[PDB]
């Protein structure tokens, strides 16, 4: 009960900031996640023995791919932690529990390939789940790990609390399917502008939680320029591997995925910031004003990509 996780002083302070980087020491990441659960939720939210076993099983079920890896999982959970701490009173005990676990699990057993590649490959998961293919797989994998003996971190919830938290995690993980994000933000935009947005409306909370999941999922665009720039190499290493696999199926990939067209990357990140990231953090900053640092950081990195193009780096 009385056993706190503490971090070194620099981590203890920087972990509270949106732009925190979890660092290159893999063995500290489980401790960093537990620390975040303890401050965001309480030291009673989860049985430590079970949580530790759940974390190590989640870690084992992430693959050694350049980007969609265990480090991405913990990075996305830390952004959720920063959003939850800067918006203390807006979220329920169930939501704070559910959302950190959702973020940690949101890309479970990812192969570094998109839903499009699975469909064109004709991968069995594409027959099993016709839309949000990988995301339905990620939720399936989360449930599987929760059902391992000694892994059910939720076992002390009432029957209906358990159903609500698994329903929060499912929606949260499905919302990380970027094809669903565009319509979700458009709706949140209309609701905020016509002033019909209402956080006591469950269906409205769902939408807001989805945008938070998009916001955390993209949070590599909200770090200090060097972090953001070096992560973009990991992201493109997956894209180019997928591009190669498209060519193997006799399909010319989109230029963003073609490793012959690396020149077109900076312009590609521009389109992504303008079409996805900026609109995402703008709408988020309108609903949850304290998340403004993510928008500011994202605009800062947009400006860095403009500089790469103008040949200034």
Ligand X SMILES: COc1ccc2nc(N)c3c(C)nc(-c4ccccc4Cl)n3c2n1
| d(C-alpha 141, C-alpha 224), whole Å | 32
Respond yes or no: is residue 68 known to be catalytic. yes
Phi, psi dihedrals of residue 310, rounded to the nearest 5°: -65, 5
> Helix (H, G, I), strand (E, B), or coil: what is residue 55?
helix
Q: Which of 37, 105, 107, 133 binds Mg ion (CB under 5 A)?
A: 107
Is residue 238 a contact point for Zn ion (CB under 5 A)?
no
37 binds, among ligand X, Zn ion, Mg ion, none (CB under 5 to 8 A by kind): none
Q: Which of 61, 75, 114, 176 binds Mg ion (CB under 5 A)?
A: 176
Residues 32, 70: contact at Cβ < 8 Å?
no
Stretch of 40-48, 104-112, 151-159, 208-216 lying at the interface with Mg ion (CB under 5 A): 104-112
Report the residue closest to Zn ion, judged by CB.
107
Stretch of 89-97, 103-111, 195-203, 249-257 lying at the interface with Mg ion (CB under 5 A): 103-111
What's the closest the beta carbon of residue 126 comes to Zn ion, in angstroms? 19
CB-wise, 41 or 219, nearer to Mg ion? 219
Helices and strands of the chain, counted as H and E runs: 15, 0
Report whether 68 belongs to an annotated binding site. Answer: yes
What's the closest the beta carbon of residue 248 comes to Zn ion, in angstroms? 25
| d(C-alpha 103, C-alpha 172), whole Å | 8
Of the candidates 191, 192, 168, 182, the residue with the CA atom closest to the CA atom of residue 214 = 182
Is residue 28 a contact point for ligand X (CB under 6 A)?
no
178 binds, among ligand X, Mg ion, Zn ion, none (CB under 5 to 8 A by kind): ligand X
Is residue 235 a contact point for ligand X (CB under 6 A)?
yes
Contacts of 80 (CB under 8 A, 6+ apart): 99, 100, 102, 103, 212, 213, 216
Is residue 217 a contact point for Zn ion (CB under 5 A)?
yes
* Alpha-carbon separation of residue 228 from 48, 91, 231, 275, 298 (angstroms): 33, 29, 5, 18, 10
The DSSP-derived string for 160-212 is HHHHHHHHHHHHHHHTT-HHHHHHHHHHHHHHHHTT---TTSHHHHHHHHHHH
Q: Which of 272, 280, 285, 288 binds ligand X (CB under 6 A)?
A: 272
CB burial of 76-99 (b: ≥16 within 10 Å; e: otherwise) equals: bbbbbbbbbbbeeeebeebbbbbb
Is residue 95 a contact point for Zn ion (CB under 5 A)?
no
Residues 155, 164: contact at Cβ < 8 Å?
no
Q: Point out the catalytic residue in the list 68, 78, 110, 138.
A: 68
- Binding mask 187-226 toward ligand X (x if CB under 6 A, else -) reads ------------------------------xx-xx-----
**Residues 240-269 interacting with ligand X (rule: CB under 6 A):** 269
Interface with Zn ion by CB under 5 A: which residues?
Answer: 107, 217
Annotated binding site for a divalent metal cation: 72, 106-107, 217
Instruction: List active site positions.
Output: 68
Binding site for ligand X (CB under 6 A): 178, 217-218, 220-221, 232, 235, 269, 272
Residue numbers in the known binding site for 3',5'-cyclic AMP are 68, 269
């Amino acid at each position: 009960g009385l056993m706190q996780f503490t971090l070194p002083v620099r981590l203890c302070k920087e972990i509270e900031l949106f732009h925190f980087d979890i660092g290159p020491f893999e063995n500290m990441w489980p401790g960093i996640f537990v620390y975040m659960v303890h401050r965001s939720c309480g030291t009673s939210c989860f049985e430590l023995e079970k949580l530790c076993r759940f974390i190590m099983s989640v870690k084992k079920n992430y693959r050694r791919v350049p980007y969609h890896n265990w480090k991405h999982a913990v990075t996305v959970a830390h952004c959720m932690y920063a959003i939850l701490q800067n918006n203390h009173t807006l979220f329920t005990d169930l939501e704070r529990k559910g959302l950190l676990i959702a973020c940690l699990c949101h890309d479970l057993d990812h192969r570094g390939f998109s839903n499009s590649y699975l469909q064109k490959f004709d991968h069995p998961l594409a027959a099993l789940y016709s839309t949000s293919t990988m995301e339905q797989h990620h939720f399936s994998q989360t449930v599987s790990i929760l059902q391992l003996e000694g892994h059910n971190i939720f076992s002390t919830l009432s029957s209906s609390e358990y159903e609500q938290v698994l329903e929060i995690i499912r929606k949260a993980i499905i919302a990380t399917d970027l094809a669903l994000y565009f319509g979700n933000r458009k709706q949140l935009e209309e609701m905020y502008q016509t002033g019909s947005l209402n956080l006591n409306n469950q269906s409205h909370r769902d939408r807001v939680i989805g945008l938070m999941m998009t916001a955390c999922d993209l949070c590599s665009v909200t770090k200090l320029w060097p972090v953001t720039k070096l992560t973009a190499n990991d992201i493109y290493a997956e894209f180019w591997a997928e591009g190669d696999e498209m060519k193997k199926l006799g399909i010319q990939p989109i230029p963003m995925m073609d490793r012959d067209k690396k020149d077109e990357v900076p312009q590609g990140q521009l389109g992504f910031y303008n079409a996805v990231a900026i609109p995402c953090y703008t709408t988020l900053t309108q609903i949850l004003p304290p998340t403004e640092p993510l928008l500011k950081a994202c605009r800062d990195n947009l400006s860095q990509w403009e500089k790469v193009i103008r040949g200034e780096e």
